[PDB]
Design an enzyme around this catalytic site. Structure first.
Site, PDB file in Angstrom:
ATOM      1  N   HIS A 150      61.380 -41.717  32.665  1.00  0.00           N
ATOM      2  CA  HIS A 150      60.919 -40.152  33.388  1.00  0.00           C
ATOM      3  C   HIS A 150      62.015 -39.983  34.714  1.00  0.00           C
ATOM      4  O   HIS A 150      62.846 -39.655  34.752  1.00  0.00           O
ATOM      5  CB  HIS A 150      59.579 -40.255  33.867  1.00  0.00           C
ATOM      6  N   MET A 198      43.888 -41.184  26.651  1.00  0.00           N
ATOM      7  CA  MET A 198      43.220 -40.082  26.029  1.00  0.00           C
ATOM      8  C   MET A 198      42.188 -39.408  26.277  1.00  0.00           C
ATOM      9  O   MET A 198      40.863 -40.062  26.359  1.00  0.00           O
ATOM     10  CB  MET A 198      43.272 -40.541  24.568  1.00  0.00           C
ATOM     11  N   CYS A 253      51.322 -34.193  26.366  1.00  0.00           N
ATOM     12  CA  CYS A 253      51.412 -35.618  26.303  1.00  0.00           C
ATOM     13  C   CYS A 253      51.973 -36.041  24.681  1.00  0.00           C
ATOM     14  O   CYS A 253      52.804 -36.849  24.597  1.00  0.00           O
ATOM     15  CB  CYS A 253      49.887 -36.228  26.337  1.00  0.00           C
ATOM     16  N   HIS A 254      51.156 -35.285  23.724  1.00  0.00           N
ATOM     17  CA  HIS A 254      51.728 -35.495  22.291  1.00  0.00           C
ATOM     18  C   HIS A 254      52.969 -35.071  22.059  1.00  0.00           C
ATOM     19  O   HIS A 254      53.345 -35.243  20.478  1.00  0.00           O
ATOM     20  CB  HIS A 254      50.626 -35.100  21.570  1.00  0.00           C
ATOM     21  N   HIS A 293      55.619 -43.619  39.637  1.00  0.00           N
ATOM     22  CA  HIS A 293      56.139 -42.358  39.561  1.00  0.00           C
ATOM     23  C   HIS A 293      56.701 -42.239  41.023  1.00  0.00           C
ATOM     24  O   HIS A 293      56.219 -41.860  42.018  1.00  0.00           O
ATOM     25  CB  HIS A 293      54.910 -41.501  39.600  1.00  0.00           C
ATOM     26  N   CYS A 319      47.085 -30.329  24.182  1.00  0.00           N
ATOM     27  CA  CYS A 319      47.587 -31.589  23.746  1.00  0.00           C
ATOM     28  C   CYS A 319      49.127 -31.744  23.808  1.00  0.00           C
ATOM     29  O   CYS A 319      49.618 -32.764  24.224  1.00  0.00           O
ATOM     30  CB  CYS A 319      47.202 -31.544  22.246  1.00  0.00           C
TER      31      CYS A 319
HETATM   32  C1  DHE Z   1      61.635 -35.121  34.060  1.00  0.00           C
HETATM   33  C2  DHE Z   1      60.775 -34.617  35.414  1.00  0.00           C
HETATM   34  C3  DHE Z   1      61.298 -34.707  36.668  1.00  0.00           C
HETATM   35  C4  DHE Z   1      62.694 -35.300  37.047  1.00  0.00           C
HETATM   36  C5  DHE Z   1      63.720 -34.319  36.944  1.00  0.00           C
HETATM   37  C6  DHE Z   1      64.889 -34.579  37.732  1.00  0.00           C
HETATM   38  O1  DHE Z   1      64.776 -34.935  39.017  1.00  0.00           O
HETATM   39  O2  DHE Z   1      65.849 -34.647  37.449  1.00  0.00           O
HETATM   40  C7  DHE Z   1      60.475 -34.326  37.824  1.00  0.00           C
HETATM   41  C8  DHE Z   1      60.187 -34.123  38.874  1.00  0.00           C
HETATM   42  C9  DHE Z   1      59.403 -33.249  39.759  1.00  0.00           C
HETATM   43  C10 DHE Z   1      59.605 -32.993  41.032  1.00  0.00           C
HETATM   44  C11 DHE Z   1      60.906 -33.050  41.917  1.00  0.00           C
HETATM   45  C12 DHE Z   1      60.616 -33.670  43.137  1.00  0.00           C
HETATM   46  C13 DHE Z   1      61.893 -34.431  43.815  1.00  0.00           C
HETATM   47  O3  DHE Z   1      61.517 -34.887  44.899  1.00  0.00           O
HETATM   48  O4  DHE Z   1      63.065 -34.572  43.265  1.00  0.00           O
HETATM   49  C14 DHE Z   1      58.520 -31.987  41.313  1.00  0.00           C
HETATM   50  C15 DHE Z   1      58.423 -31.444  42.858  1.00  0.00           C
HETATM   51  C16 DHE Z   1      57.822 -32.001  40.033  1.00  0.00           C
HETATM   52  C17 DHE Z   1      56.626 -31.372  40.106  1.00  0.00           C
HETATM   53  C18 DHE Z   1      55.720 -31.208  39.257  1.00  0.00           C
HETATM   54  N1  DHE Z   1      55.710 -32.140  37.956  1.00  0.00           N
HETATM   55 FE1  DHE Z   1      57.686 -32.978  37.438  1.00  0.00          FE
HETATM   56  N2  DHE Z   1      56.527 -33.145  35.519  1.00  0.00           N
HETATM   57  C19 DHE Z   1      57.216 -33.303  34.329  1.00  0.00           C
HETATM   58  C20 DHE Z   1      58.599 -33.674  34.284  1.00  0.00           C
HETATM   59  C21 DHE Z   1      59.510 -34.012  35.531  1.00  0.00           C
HETATM   60  N3  DHE Z   1      59.322 -33.806  36.714  1.00  0.00           N
HETATM   61  C22 DHE Z   1      56.432 -33.213  33.189  1.00  0.00           C
HETATM   62  O5  DHE Z   1      56.651 -33.331  32.102  1.00  0.00           O
HETATM   63  C23 DHE Z   1      55.144 -33.114  33.779  1.00  0.00           C
HETATM   64  C24 DHE Z   1      54.336 -34.825  33.818  1.00  0.00           C
HETATM   65  C25 DHE Z   1      54.092 -32.457  33.017  1.00  0.00           C
HETATM   66  C26 DHE Z   1      54.306 -31.172  33.244  1.00  0.00           C
HETATM   67  O6  DHE Z   1      53.318 -30.199  33.379  1.00  0.00           O
HETATM   68  O7  DHE Z   1      55.550 -30.454  33.314  1.00  0.00           O
HETATM   69  C27 DHE Z   1      55.329 -33.126  35.242  1.00  0.00           C
HETATM   70  C28 DHE Z   1      54.273 -32.575  36.148  1.00  0.00           C
HETATM   71  C29 DHE Z   1      54.473 -32.083  37.377  1.00  0.00           C
HETATM   72  C30 DHE Z   1      53.460 -31.643  38.169  1.00  0.00           C
HETATM   73  O8  DHE Z   1      52.539 -31.423  37.937  1.00  0.00           O
HETATM   74  C31 DHE Z   1      54.080 -30.644  39.400  1.00  0.00           C
HETATM   75  C32 DHE Z   1      53.502 -31.518  40.785  1.00  0.00           C
HETATM   76  C33 DHE Z   1      53.976 -29.497  39.212  1.00  0.00           C
HETATM   77  C34 DHE Z   1      54.379 -28.648  38.207  1.00  0.00           C
HETATM   78  O9  DHE Z   1      55.167 -27.676  38.435  1.00  0.00           O
HETATM   79  O10 DHE Z   1      54.143 -29.031  36.959  1.00  0.00           O
HETATM   80  N4  DHE Z   1      58.273 -32.608  39.317  1.00  0.00           N
HETATM   81  C1  HEC Z   2      47.675 -37.027  27.687  1.00  0.00           C
HETATM   82  C2  HEC Z   2      47.156 -36.599  29.265  1.00  0.00           C
HETATM   83  C3  HEC Z   2      46.920 -36.447  26.518  1.00  0.00           C
HETATM   84  C4  HEC Z   2      46.449 -35.238  26.396  1.00  0.00           C
HETATM   85  C5  HEC Z   2      46.379 -34.000  27.064  1.00  0.00           C
HETATM   86  C6  HEC Z   2      45.846 -35.431  24.983  1.00  0.00           C
HETATM   87  N1  HEC Z   2      46.103 -36.736  24.189  1.00  0.00           N
HETATM   88 FE1  HEC Z   2      45.548 -37.440  22.532  1.00  0.00          FE
HETATM   89  N2  HEC Z   2      46.288 -39.322  23.142  1.00  0.00           N
HETATM   90  C7  HEC Z   2      46.776 -39.632  24.256  1.00  0.00           C
HETATM   91  C8  HEC Z   2      47.282 -40.719  24.215  1.00  0.00           C
HETATM   92  C9  HEC Z   2      47.745 -41.855  25.284  1.00  0.00           C
HETATM   93  C10 HEC Z   2      46.580 -41.401  23.108  1.00  0.00           C
HETATM   94  C11 HEC Z   2      46.672 -43.051  22.589  1.00  0.00           C
HETATM   95  C12 HEC Z   2      44.891 -43.366  23.020  1.00  0.00           C
HETATM   96  C13 HEC Z   2      44.595 -44.700  22.567  1.00  0.00           C
HETATM   97  O1  HEC Z   2      43.700 -45.319  22.999  1.00  0.00           O
HETATM   98  O2  HEC Z   2      45.442 -45.590  21.674  1.00  0.00           O
HETATM   99  C14 HEC Z   2      46.066 -40.584  22.324  1.00  0.00           C
HETATM  100  C15 HEC Z   2      45.346 -40.353  21.202  1.00  0.00           C
HETATM  101  C16 HEC Z   2      45.087 -39.390  20.544  1.00  0.00           C
HETATM  102  C17 HEC Z   2      44.251 -39.216  19.049  1.00  0.00           C
HETATM  103  C18 HEC Z   2      44.053 -40.764  18.353  1.00  0.00           C
HETATM  104  C19 HEC Z   2      45.337 -41.223  17.555  1.00  0.00           C
HETATM  105  C20 HEC Z   2      44.948 -42.323  16.530  1.00  0.00           C
HETATM  106  O3  HEC Z   2      44.753 -43.420  17.017  1.00  0.00           O
HETATM  107  O4  HEC Z   2      44.987 -42.006  15.300  1.00  0.00           O
HETATM  108  C21 HEC Z   2      44.101 -38.193  18.744  1.00  0.00           C
HETATM  109  C22 HEC Z   2      43.420 -37.788  17.640  1.00  0.00           C
HETATM  110  C23 HEC Z   2      44.443 -37.442  20.112  1.00  0.00           C
HETATM  111  N3  HEC Z   2      44.943 -38.093  20.873  1.00  0.00           N
HETATM  112  C24 HEC Z   2      44.288 -36.005  19.850  1.00  0.00           C
HETATM  113  C25 HEC Z   2      44.554 -34.974  20.667  1.00  0.00           C
HETATM  114  C26 HEC Z   2      44.064 -33.820  20.640  1.00  0.00           C
HETATM  115  C27 HEC Z   2      43.612 -32.814  19.639  1.00  0.00           C
HETATM  116  C28 HEC Z   2      44.399 -33.430  22.096  1.00  0.00           C
HETATM  117  C29 HEC Z   2      44.415 -32.031  22.649  1.00  0.00           C
HETATM  118  C30 HEC Z   2      43.374 -31.188  22.464  1.00  0.00           C
HETATM  119  C31 HEC Z   2      45.103 -34.421  22.817  1.00  0.00           C
HETATM  120  N4  HEC Z   2      45.033 -35.525  21.994  1.00  0.00           N
HETATM  121  C32 HEC Z   2      45.298 -34.524  24.115  1.00  0.00           C
HETATM  122  C33 HEC Z   2      47.314 -38.483  25.330  1.00  0.00           C
HETATM  123  C34 HEC Z   2      46.776 -37.317  25.599  1.00  0.00           C
END
Ligand code: DHE
Ligand code: HEC
Ligand code: DHE
Ligand code: HEC
EC number: 1.7.2.1
Lengths: 539, 538
Positions: free
Chosen positions: A323, A84, A46-47, A365, A43
């Site tokens: 982002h 979610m 995202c959360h 993105h 969780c």
């Molecule tokens: C804030 C951020 C940037 C920009 C930084 C910058 O350029 O200053 C970025 C860029 C990137 C870039 C930059 C590429 C470029 O061309 O600059 C790559 C390759 C990349 C690989 C991935 N990113 Fe990324 N990425 C996140 C955050 C970020 N990634 C997350 O929070 C997210 C959604 C969840 C996570 O698991 O971290 C996420 C998932 C991914 C992936 O799934 C990737 C493919 C593999 C991985 O290791 O998680 N992100």
């Molecule tokens: C992103 C890829 C997510 C992951 C991983 C999990 N959650 Fe989540 N959650 C996410 C969003 C965008 C939202 C909003 C959904 C909507 O229709 O508004 C939520 C919401 C919840 C909620 C309900 C909140 C409320 O209205 O009271 C719960 C209880 C929740 N999410 C629980 C939860 C748990 C326990 C997770 C991991 C096992 C989890 N979320 C993962 C996005 C994402």
């Protein structure tokens, strides 16, 4: 006693409005820890750590207890059509585990550790002092055409020789390095892991080696170096997800100088957010500054390093959920995506103000984006989407094309949603688009290619994972990346840890397979950054 | 697709994120009883999240480590380092102290946040700027009016300087901490400890409130834009809770910007969850406000040239920044880092820390007292709470570089517990009160030094005794001159059920001139002469 009576009066805060948190369902240690483990594995992403990171209602006690056990279990079990996921219906979690998660989120959020200067300095290490380093390049590698590739699950990165297509050196780094950046001198490659561990590598050593390392937080994603004239290798900045902060270090030794908290008021509701993760960071070419993205609060900070003892920061409001992003062709306008707000913010780095907010597709993105000259609209910056199969073209020439400046001038349609990276080069008449997270395997294993000279024609689908000849596994294709001269484009065939992966190289001039990089060491290859193109922001 | 994109594990290790507890169980009435004592008796020093005092914080990790008995003994006898004794003194009962010991072992209850939605809800435009007079609609000598705080009454009284009469009494926020003037000299701004601000038009037939707003749960400071071309443009206010400050329209008080002060400390460079906002002073060199952030020891230079894209310069100084004021040239902000026993000099023009001057025990200057010393040139003085010294610090880098930012000299007062020192361009005297001195006779009188003969010891004016008030503590506090500088006012701060008064002295002769009494004059504390406050004359 005098000073004790001076500060002896009652606080103006009313005890009656200060609330004790509780009323949550009872759960033992065994139970609480099991839930907590599931929370950070499944969780937290995202959360967030303090559960206010996603859209919609936060998972804090005030809200969760209001919803109740039943509602929570039901919501966690089936998910929602708004992002979610469904943990029960999919079979990911057991009803026993969902019952625990519903109980857990009704409790106060366990606190992760802070990470300040004392922790930072403790983690700081200078492996090779600036004096003990080479004065010139001691190897004969073509450094500009080198590719820093992330061997994600291995917690390493591999330097791949552009022309020879061979792995030159494999280096140990932090776990799952997210991005690679280059110093302005083109000598040092900087890498940062999701564990917030940075490593400075000297490309001039006989064999490229690490010269410094530090850990700037518990979790991070970005790192950047000073790129203003006269500041080559002066400072290095890095942003953390937790704690909500960024740190400025010495560009030569990685010595921690300043740490700044990003906890603050949001741009939209102007309320306090306890966890505004730091996203992208880019270095200004107009002023000695670092342009920092603060996600949840939707703020773009211009941190001036001209004098880091007395730090000056200009806070520009943009839109929530900032982002990734990158420069426009002229390197003056920072085109950044506010993906959950389905918008692209334009930050003028010279005038230092928000030039505009452009409406685009679902969950834009762009990565660093793709810049090219449209026949009809002039200079444009483009982006793909995770939410749909569209590609947005935004005009970026205010001076000589006011009619199109900051306007979603036109669209293109790729294979579908789940797209992560769009790409092109000045010397190339092609535009690449991947679909890494698209639920259709055939689509996720291929890339669409548009003809910049005939934008009306449909794209051509290049079977990258198929050209790899790898066998079983998801084999997700990701991030197209050009070489120094831009005559070939590289792709990563991101397969499992126990599976076989590769890097596929296409002939940009012919759109034909040119090479396939394989090596037992190439484990979970993700990002690839050509030294020249990253350093000179060629995209 | 987006759900798979953001679907990987957080880099945060579950094993290091800690569940808090192991605390002594206590019912709702027990927890509330203790909680009430905490904010009545403790919060002041320790703060809302218990990290505001020196020494170890009262958070669960430290308290549970110390244990139940250690805590009860510490609370019962206190320490010589600023922690009062609650049992020994007989203030709290053994039963209540036990409750306090168990209470601090629990997670600190959370007060609510206070953002823009809350700010706008409290915002009120009582008289729209278009409906306000275009000229002064009364015969009042506005420049010589004194804004007096009637602390426990939650009111302020505007007193006519010459007539010595209460011209108007106005309802405000509770226990108003300070009164400030707008650059145009038309509006008077007051803010209560309850963070409620009130704007008063002195041009109305009867001076009255035109606007009001609440910027937090607890506050102390407010200020107006004094840079050229920015007369009545913006109004800033700093809060204790939440840890923030707000910028508003200087005409209507419409909330515009809100900035959190939560951040990293100057010394240890670690994260502090509650850096309260102390003094705030408007710059004359640049269009910026100079804000003091206590616990982190930072002096922020907030630029208001473009309120949409706020620019802030963070200058480190020293921990526990509190009160301060300008040097004679209005260029250097002399501010006390009281628990650090240092005075920080902030250059407002060059925008940097000019020095950290070591002074006495717990300096408390208020806005300070400037004057030219026969030998050392122009200096800025300050008295102390911790001792009876008075530090004179050189403030002239141009003509007296050998003395600039140096504790050039020292004077000795009646003792510690001093809060304010005062003088005036037209005066040759230097007054210093001793409000919290544990001696009744000392706390009810002030010291006066002859600036023409500093070697000579001070004289003691029996202010409280001159008032002829009868019973009560009769604490004398804060000297303040009139516009002319020939009269020095003092407040005789007695209880609310007792009789208080304002005593006025003839500065030229040091002889009693008047005594202001009135049934409405309940618990008079701060007094602000309109002209002197407006033009920072001190
Ligand atoms: C804030 C951020 C940037 C920009 C930084 C910058 O350029 O200053 C970025 C860029 C990137 C870039 C930059 C590429 C470029 O061309 O600059 C790559 C390759 C990349 C690989 C991935 N990113 Fe990324 N990425 C996140 C955050 C970020 N990634 C997350 O929070 C997210 C959604 C969840 C996570 O698991 O971290 C996420 C998932 C991914 C992936 O799934 C990737 C493919 C593999 C991985 O290791 O998680 N992100
Ligand atoms: C992103 C890829 C997510 C992951 C991983 C999990 N959650 Fe989540 N959650 C996410 C969003 C965008 C939202 C909003 C959904 C909507 O229709 O508004 C939520 C919401 C919840 C909620 C309900 C909140 C409320 O209205 O009271 C719960 C209880 C929740 N999410 C629980 C939860 C748990 C326990 C997770 C991991 C096992 C989890 N979320 C993962 C996005 C994402
Ligand atoms: C931050 C701050 C300032 C500077 C504001 C500025 O210049 O913009 C200030 C100034 C002031 C000034 C300004 C005087 C001046 O001439 O500038 C006055 C009159 C004043 C009356 C008091 N102050 Fe004050 N004061 C505090 C805070 C502050 N006081 C406290 O937190 C403290 C220590 C504890 C408390 O109970 O609030 C405290 C106790 C007091 C008192 O005991 C006084 C005498 C009565 C009261 O109302 O509590 N403080
Ligand atoms: C300021 C005028 C104070 C008031 C009012 C209260 N406390 Fe305090 N306390 C103060 C200081 C400066 C210190 C440090 C003292 C030292 O010599 O180190 C303390 C310390 C404590 C502690 C001990 C901290 C530790 O070492 O674990 C406790 C338990 C404590 N104070 C409790 C406390 C309570 C419960 C109060 C109100 C009833 C209270 N303090 C008021 C300053 C001040």
């Amino acid at each position: 006693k005098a000073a004790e009576q001076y500060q002896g009066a009652a606080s103006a805060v009313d005890p009656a409005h200060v609330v004790r948190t509780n009323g949550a369902p009872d759960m033992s240690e065994s139970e609480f820890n099991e839930a907590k483990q599931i929370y950070f594995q499944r969780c937290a992403g995202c959360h967030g750590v303090l559960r206010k990171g996603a859209t919609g209602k936060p998972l804090t006690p005030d809200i969760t207890q209001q919803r109740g056990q039943q509602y929570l279990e039901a919501l966690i079990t089936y998910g929602t059509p708004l992002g979610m996921p469904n943990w029960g219906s999919s079979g990911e979690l057991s009803k026993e585990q969902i019952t625990l998660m519903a109980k857990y989120i009704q409790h106060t959020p366990p606190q992760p550790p802070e990470w300040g200067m004392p922790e930072m300095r403790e983690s700081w290490k200078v492996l090779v002092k600036p004096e003990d380093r080479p004065k010139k390049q001691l190897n004969d590698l073509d450094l500009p055409n080198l590719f820093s590739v992330t061997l994600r699950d291995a917690g390493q990165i591999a330097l791949v020789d552009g022309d020879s297509k061979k792995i030159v050196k494999v280096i140990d780094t932090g776990y799952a390095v997210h991005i690679s950046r280059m110093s302005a001198s083109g000598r040092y490659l900087l890498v940062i892991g999701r564990d917030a561990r940075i490593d400075m590598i000297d490309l001039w050593a006989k064999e490229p080696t690490k010269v410094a390392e530090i850990k700037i937080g518990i979790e991070a994603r970005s790192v950047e170096s000073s790129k203003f004239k006269g500041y080559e290798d002066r400072y290095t900045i890095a942003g953390a997800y937790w704690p909500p902060q960024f740190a400025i270090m010495d560009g030569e030794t990685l010595e921690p100088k300043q740490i700044v908290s990003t906890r603050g008021m949001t741009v939209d509701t102007q309320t306090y957010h306890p966890e505004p993760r730091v996203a992208a960071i880019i270095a200004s070419h107009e002023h000695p500054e670092f342009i920092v993205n603060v996600k949840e609060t939707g703020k773009v900070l211009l941190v001036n390093y001209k004098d880091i003892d007395n730090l000056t920061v200009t806070s520009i409001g943009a839109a929530p959920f900032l982002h990734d992003g990158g420069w426009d062709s002229s390197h003056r306008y920072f085109m950044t995506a506010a993906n959950n707000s389905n918008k692209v913010a334009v930050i003028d780095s010279k005038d230092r103000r928000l030039s505009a907010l452009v409406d685009v597709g679902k969950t834009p993105h762009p990565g660093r984006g793709a810049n090219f000259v449209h026949p009809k609209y002039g200079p444009v910056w483009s982006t793909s989407h995770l939410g749909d199969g569209s590609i947005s073209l935004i005009g970026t020439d205010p001076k000589n094309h006011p009619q199109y400046a900051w306007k979603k001038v036109a669209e293109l349609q790729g294979q579908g949603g789940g797209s992560l990276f769009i790409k092109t080069h000045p010397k190339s008449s092609h535009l690449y688009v991947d679909t890494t997270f698209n639920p259709d395997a055939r689509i996720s294993q291929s890339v669409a290619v548009f003809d910049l000279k005939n934008l009306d024609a449909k794209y051509q689908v290049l079977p990258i994972a198929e050209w790899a000849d790898l066998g079983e596994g998801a084999k997700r294709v990701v991030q197209p990346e050009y070489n120094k001269r831009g005559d070939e484009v590289w792709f990563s065939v991101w397969n499992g840890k126990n599976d076989s992966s590769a890097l596929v190289v296409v002939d940009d001039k012919t759109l034909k397979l040119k090479a396939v990089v394989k090596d037992p060491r190439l484990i979970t290859p993700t990002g690839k950054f050509n030294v020249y193109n990253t350093q000179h922001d060629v995209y």
